[PDB]
Design a protein around this ligand. Structure first.
Ligand SMILES: COc1cccc2c1C(=O)c1c(O)c3c(c(O)c1C2=O)C[C@@](O)(C(=O)CO)C[C@@H]3O[C@H]1C[C@H](N)[C@H](O)[C@H](C)O1
Ligand SMILES: CCCCCCCCCCCCO[C@@H]1O[C@H](CO)[C@@H](O[C@H]2O[C@H](CO)[C@@H](O)[C@H](O)[C@H]2O)[C@H](O)[C@H]1O
Ligand SMILES: CCCCCCCCCCCCO[C@@H]1O[C@H](CO)[C@@H](O[C@H]2O[C@H](CO)[C@@H](O)[C@H](O)[C@H]2O)[C@H](O)[C@H]1O
Ligand SMILES: CCCCCCCCCCCCO[C@H]1O[C@H](CO)[C@@H](O[C@H]2O[C@H](CO)[C@@H](O)[C@H](O)[C@H]2O)[C@H](O)[C@H]1O
Ligand SMILES: CCCCCCCCCCCC
Ligand SMILES: CCCCCCCCCC
Ligand SMILES: CCCCCC
Lengths: 156, 1033, 48
């Protein structure tokens, strides 16, 4: 929303670590959001920029920022297979059970995309295996519908 | 031959007359256009898919069409864009020389066979196959000044009452409407829809039923019952014609017997076919017509015809309607033609003055005055026969030939005058002896000059097409000039020249001329004395020559190249780029600000600003716009400060301020298709099904590396668009099935409302037009609106979208590119200063060799040619050099003497480089064609000097030095005469400012600088060349 | 099929004609639209 806010959103999305570093030194708003409500952390989480994720969290980024449809950076990291970002976010307080407006959780998303390691990390951190989205579905329902036998075992 | 015509002056007049008549005819019938066709033929396929995103367009239309572009002849390459405005354009580009009509019909026929593979809604919109052009003759704007008409009202007016008459106007090849004719607009209200358990599906169904043409039959049709007295057609349902009729369309009958009409769930009005562009002219709603010249037409006639048509439409205009002319090439083109005629006439007047000054009789002065126009007229005839037009290139081709034509006239006449004064030979016998001295050389000269210019006709691609125009024009003129010198001029000399007593050089004349004669007779002696000393010291002049050659090499390497110079064409452009995702309203505020600046801080210069919001070149969408600026007439813009380049710089300077928008102004290129020299055009290609995201990463990787080589590469950048947030909505199939809601109903409800839907056609005051349904704006603006749309289940219950869908934000591409049928990303850039484009390209290839597995690349556009029709320039000059040498060798019956003429080349080139370098010019085509003519002329001077010297040696048994001194003594006057005339004649071009001055400066400065050094250097060096070459061999 | 002259003319004939512009060597064009829904447009070109 500011000159530096805008640049920070851009730099985080592009994975320009040096630019981000300089922007952090200059006070660029870690809480800048674009129209859809994405923070630099959302952007970094989506595009898989690990170092930028860590730098943002050291500079007071809201690990549980949500967009206009209620989705968090952990949602994005879990959906797009970014294992180590997922670990970092959870280390830093990410709500493992956050529900977006559809009642969808990070577990649902990792399951849907067959990201096994991420699923296990999430469970490790207290992911509610019985959580249901707006349609009453759980991550287990998702896995049998997808025919992912392995993930379905993990979720016994 | 000259002897033949010397005794047959009347036969020579006959030939002259036939040539003048042919030429006059040609000048009446020749087409006129700013530029001839130059870009290779290209065909564009264009399609719309209303409401569709780039990927939907790409995967259901673009890929399907591309996969059918087989079995078409002479295809060089194909590229395409698929974008989130619901649009696709595929461009197929053909080999130079391909018949454009055949290319187009072959593409159109392959498309025809693919149509059944395309989505219904795309088959229904239709897919246009057109020939690509970027040049308009003019743009006619239509505005309303009394605030009574929207741009949509205006566009419909233009479509109904102007376009077709313009299209039928003489010389117009094509007309493009800026806007659409009306569409019947149905703006749905989901609240009413639900109030009555209806959906857009029912709206669509009702319109299809109640707005239709229905076949019936005949009364007493064959075969009839015999005795039938009457046969008549039966007319049943015909299409609706008014908003009122559509409002009354019946949607439903309630139990209480109440009727639900379409007007009860929608707003109904005539509107635009689409709403992506907002066009304003000085802040007033605008539409218009883009008009193109038909093949072979005359630009000036057509422009006057178009205005005549517009004039007779005026009386019928509604209040407030007014025609404006933001763009018209015709006035610029008129000036070029006037400026060229002026140049040719002044040249003839200068030749007249110089002839008189040196020769001091009006009879001698008459001969070139007759011969040159005969050559010119004839050149028109040959150009017409070759299918050429009068255009910017062919017109300068002629002025570039002025020296050569003037020289032929001057040479023949001057030489006869010299022979008479030196021998007191009567005019007829003098003319015989004189032609005897020069005719062989004139023929040799014609061969040599052909060897110099013809090869230029053989370059490939676009540049070749430009060079071709000069090549054939100059070669034709030169050939006619030699023919006239062998046929007409000798007969004129023999019949019009009065005798001169042996020894009379007018030194005894009284007043100014006796003085000039005395002055010049003794300057010639100083001249010869000087050559004498030079010829005792040849060693050091060889040293000075190598220094000249070296300075030439040096200057040449550092002179930046370009194509054609920019002109103050009376218009220029300003781009407006807001951040991705910016809305139409945001863009409009910037355009308004831009417009305000021009009409405010440039009020003295600017006539109008045509602000087009929603239009881009490398992207469309609500975040892009263009401000097309039209300037007041050149005469009211005196001074470099009030010219396009200056205005442009100030404009951009001022807009660097503007917050979140890239805004800048730039002049127009002489010909868009050439891009920039230094410029390259690169394609990165997904060769292995990597997908959009990996292609993007590869692209970024390549862009970061490029940026590490500022020494070689500059402004290396994507030509397309970055990904942006998009709203992903998932239909839950299970929930829809459980609720008894069909996917078709769900999908047309969403698409119709949020994307709009072309239902069918209606008839508006006699013209067929489209009917569109879409949600009224306020119900398709935000994610929360999605849940206010209901769909009817099988059991009659109305179900909100929120019950069976879920949504999330993600990123996607608003514009997907393909090259040769594979996913691609275009990258533009240019060589850094002092670097060749070849060097820049070599590096790009190097950088590209290091990219992730499965990523390839290719060169397109101007770079595609470079990598081809740019590996010829040295093979062609080599042939030229060899043929010239061969002609010379036959002329002189010697393998060595030709060297003494060829050494002359650098002498003119050094002066042309010096002038261009000093004037801050570039090595462009005008410069280059000028080098050739400058070289041509100096070569001609040297050829005659050497011929005379050699002949004196062969025939009068004269010493090497003696012969050289006498030859150069005889050649001095005619050489000076020509240089004076030609130099004075090109001077106006050099200092010219204003319209067309760019081209004028480019032609003039190189020529004047080359002629200076060639003239001054040659008269001292060719005697050195001759003497040293002879001694050596 | 089934359309009268006027309907054929407004929906077909005029639509095609307004696109028959700027063709090379065109001398004239004539057409008719009839009650059997049939349309014929004839374009005649310069000799040669
Ligand atoms: C209305 O608003 C305008 C106002 C002023 C100028 C303009 C326009 C305009 O709409 C416009 C165009 O729509 C187009 C062009 C254009 O120059 C202008 C204006 O200058 C050129 C074009 O070749 C491209 O831009 C493609 O990249 C074709 C394109 O239109 C579409 C519709 C064409 N008839 C063609 O069928 C094809 C679909 O391109
Ligand atoms: C239409 C355009 C006319 C404008 C030209 C303006 C003049 C500028 C260039 C003139 C060059 C002539 O320069 C000429 O050089 C030679 C030697 O190289 C001189 O010759 C003299 O010097 C040399 C060497 O020092 C001796 O070998 C020679 O025997 C001696 O006579 C000439 O006396 C001189 O005239
Ligand atoms: C007396 C009248 C005047 C006579 C003028 C003669 C002009 C005739 C033009 C012929 C040349 C056409 O252009 C053609 O270019 C290609 C290269 O792309 C050449 O092909 C060759 O040239 C290139 C040089 O660039 C070399 O790699 C190699 O020798 C070969 O590829 C052809 O040998 C040449 O013929
Ligand atoms: C009705 C009028 C039709 C004319 C259409 C013109 C087509 C060009 C638009 C697309 C290019 C967009 O951006 C581009 O435009 C210009 C070329 O035209 C470039 O301008 C370039 O060529 C100009 C004209 O010869 C020069 O004055 C500039 O020095 C040079 O930079 C811009 O540097 C570039 O940003
Ligand atoms: C008396 C000799 C006449 C010489 C004719 C020379 C013609 C030169 C022609 C060059 C042909 C390539
Ligand atoms: C355009 C007509 C020019 C003809 C001039 C003929 C002069 C003949 C003099 C003998
Ligand atoms: C239409 C007449 C043009 C003349 C240009 C030489």
């Amino acid at each position: 929303g500011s000159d530096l806010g805008k640049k920070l959103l851009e730099a985080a999305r592009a994975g320009r670590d040096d630019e981000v570093r300089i922007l952090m030194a200059n006070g660029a708003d870690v809480n800048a959001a674009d129209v859809v409500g994405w923070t630099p952390l959302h952007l970094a989480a989506y595009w898989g920029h690990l170092e930028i994720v860590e730098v943002l969290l050291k500079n007071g980024a809201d690990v549980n920022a949500y967009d206009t449809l209620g989705s968090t950076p952990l949602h994005l990291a879990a959906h797009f297979g970014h294992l180590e970002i997922v670990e970092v976010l959870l280390k830093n307080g990410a709500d493992v059970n956050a529900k977006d407006d559809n009642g969808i959780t990070p577990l649902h998303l990792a399951a849907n995309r067959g990201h096994l390691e991420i699923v296990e990390v999430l469970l490790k951190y207290g992911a509610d295996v019985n959580a249901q989205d707006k349609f009453g579905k759980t991550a287990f329902d998702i896995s049998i519908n997808n025919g992912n036998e392995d993930l379905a075992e993990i979720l016994q | 031959m000259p002897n033949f015509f010397i005794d047959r002056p009347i036969f020579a007049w006959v030939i002259a007359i036939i040539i003048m008549l042919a030429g006059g005819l040609a000048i009446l019938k020749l087409p006129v256009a700013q530029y001839p066709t130059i870009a290779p033929p290209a065909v564009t396929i264009s399609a719309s898919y209303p409401g569709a995103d780039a990927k939907t367009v790409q995967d259901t239309v673009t890929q399907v069409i591309e996969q059918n572009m087989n079995g078409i002849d002479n295809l060089m390459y194909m590229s395409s864009n698929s974008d989130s405005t619901g649009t696709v354009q595929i461009t197929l580009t053909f080999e130079s020389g391909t018949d454009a009509d055949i290319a187009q019909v072959q593409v159109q026929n392959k498309l025809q066979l693919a149509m059944p593979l395309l989505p219904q809604e795309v088959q229904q919109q239709g897919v246009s196959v057109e020939k690509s052009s970027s040049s308009f003759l003019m743009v006619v704007g239509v505005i309303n000044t009394d605030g009574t008409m929207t741009q949509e009202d205006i566009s419909d007016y233009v479509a109904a009452n102007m376009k077709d008459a313009i299209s039928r106007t003489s010389g117009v090849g094509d007309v493009q409407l800026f806007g659409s004719q009306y569409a019947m607009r149905i703006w749905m209200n989901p609240n009413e829809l639900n109030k009555f358990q209806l959906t857009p599906v029912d709206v669509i169904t009702a319109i299809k039923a109640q707005n239709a043409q229905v076949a019936a039959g005949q009364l007493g049709g064959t075969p009839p019952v015999k005795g039938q007295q009457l046969n008549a057609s039966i007319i049943a349902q015909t299409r609706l014609t008014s908003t009122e009729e559509f409002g009354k369309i019946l949607l439903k009958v309630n139990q209480d017997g109440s009727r639900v009409l379409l007007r009860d769930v929608a707003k109904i009005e005539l509107g635009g076919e689409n709403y992506d562009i907002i066009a304003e002219f000085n802040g007033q709603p605008a539409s218009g017509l883009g008009i193109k010249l038909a093949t072979g037409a005359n630009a000036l006639d057509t422009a006057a015809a178009i205005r005549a048509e517009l004039a007779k439409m005026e009386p019928f205009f509604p209040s407030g309607l007014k025609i404006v002319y933001p763009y018209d090439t015709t006035p610029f083109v008129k000036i070029s033609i006037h400026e060229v005629v002026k140049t040719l006439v002044e040249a003839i007047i200068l030749v007249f003055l110089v002839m008189y000054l040196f020769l001091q009789n009006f009879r001698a002065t008459l001969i070139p005055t007759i011969a040159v126009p005969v050559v010119l007229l004839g050149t028109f005839a040959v150009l017409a026969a070759f299918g050429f037009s009068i255009n910017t290139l062919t017109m300068f081709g002629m002025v570039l030939a002025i020296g050569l034509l003037v020289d032929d006239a001057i040479v023949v006449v001057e030489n006869v005058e010299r022979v008479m004064a030196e021998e007191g030979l009567p005019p007829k016998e003098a003319t015989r002896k004189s032609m005897g001295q020069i005719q062989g050389a004139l023929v040799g000269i014609a061969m040599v000059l052909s060897a110099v210019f013809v090869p230029m006709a053989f370059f490939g691609g676009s540049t070749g097409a430009i060079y071709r125009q000069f090549s054939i024009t100059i070669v034709s003129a030169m050939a006619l000039s030699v023919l006239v010198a062998l046929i007409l001029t000798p007969a004129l000399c023999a019949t019009m020249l009065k005798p001169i007593a042996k020894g009379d050089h007018g030194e005894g004349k009284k007043g100014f001329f006796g003085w000039f004669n005395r002055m010049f007779e003794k300057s010639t002696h100083h001249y010869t004395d000087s050559v004498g000393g030079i010829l005792r010291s040849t060693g050091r002049y060889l040293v000075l020559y190598l220094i000249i050659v070296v300075g030439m090499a040096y200057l040449f390497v550092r002179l930046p190249s370009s194509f054609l110079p920019d002109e103050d064409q009376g218009v220029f452009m300003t781009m407006v780029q807001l951040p991705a995702g910016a809305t139409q309203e945001r863009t409009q505020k910037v355009l308004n600000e831009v417009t305000h600046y021009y009409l405010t801080k440039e009020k003295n210069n600017v006539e109008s600003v045509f602000a087009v919001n929603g239009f881009g070149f490398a992207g469309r969408g609500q975040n892009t716009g263009i401000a097309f600026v039209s300037l007041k007439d050149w005469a009211d813009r005196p001074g470099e400060e009030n010219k396009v380049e200056a205005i442009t710089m100030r404009a951009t300077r001022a807009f660097s301020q503007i917050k979140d928008a890239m805004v800048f102004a730039f002049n127009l290129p002489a010909i868009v298709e050439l891009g920039t020299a230094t410029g390259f055009d690169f394609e990165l290609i997904d060769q292995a099904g990597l997908g959009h995201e990996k292609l993007t990463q590869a692209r970024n990787q390549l862009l970061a590396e490029a940026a590490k080589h500022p020494d070689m590469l500059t402004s290396v950048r994507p030509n397309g668009l970055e990904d942006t947030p998009q709203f992903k909505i998932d239909i839950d199939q299970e929930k829809a099935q459980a609720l008894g809601v069909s996917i078709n109903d769900i999908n047309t409800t969403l698409g119709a409302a949020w994307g709009g839907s072309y239902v069918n056609d209606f008839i508006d005051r006699g013209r067929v037009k489209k009917v569109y349904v879409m949600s009224e704006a306020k119900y398709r603006m935000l994610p929360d609106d999605i849940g206010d749309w209901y769909v009817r289940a099988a059991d009659g219950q109305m179900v909100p979208f929120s019950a069976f869908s879920s949504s999330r934000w993600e990123y996607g591409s608003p514009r997907l590119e393909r090259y040769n049928g594979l996913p691609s990303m275009e990258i533009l850039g240019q060589a850094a200063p002092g670097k060749s484009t070849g060097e820049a390209m070599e590096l790009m290839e190097q950088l590209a060799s290091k990219l992730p597995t499965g990523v390839g690349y290719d060169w397109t556009g101007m770079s595609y040619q470079e990598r081809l029709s740019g590996n010829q320039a040295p093979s062609l000059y080599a042939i030229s050099l060899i043929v010239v040498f061969l002609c010379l060798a036959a002329l002189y019956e010697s393998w060595s003497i030709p060297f003494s003429v060829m050494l002359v080349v650098p002498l003119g080139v050094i002066g042309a480089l010096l002038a261009a370098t000093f004037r801050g010019l570039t090595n462009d085509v005008y410069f280059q064609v000028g080098l050739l003519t400058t070289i041509g002329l100096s070569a001609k001077n040297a050829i005659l000097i050497v011929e005379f010297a050699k002949d004196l040696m062969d025939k009068e048994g004269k010493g090497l030095i003696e012969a050289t001194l006498d030859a150069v003594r005889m050649r001095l006057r005619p050489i000076l005469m020509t240089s004076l005339a030609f130099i004075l004649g090109v001077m106006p071009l050099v200092i010219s400012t204003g319209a067309g001055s760019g081209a004028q400066n480019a032609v003039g400065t190189g020529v004047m600088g080359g002629m200076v050094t060639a003239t001054v250097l040659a008269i001292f060096f060719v005697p050195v060349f001759f003497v040293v070459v002879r001694r050596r061999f």
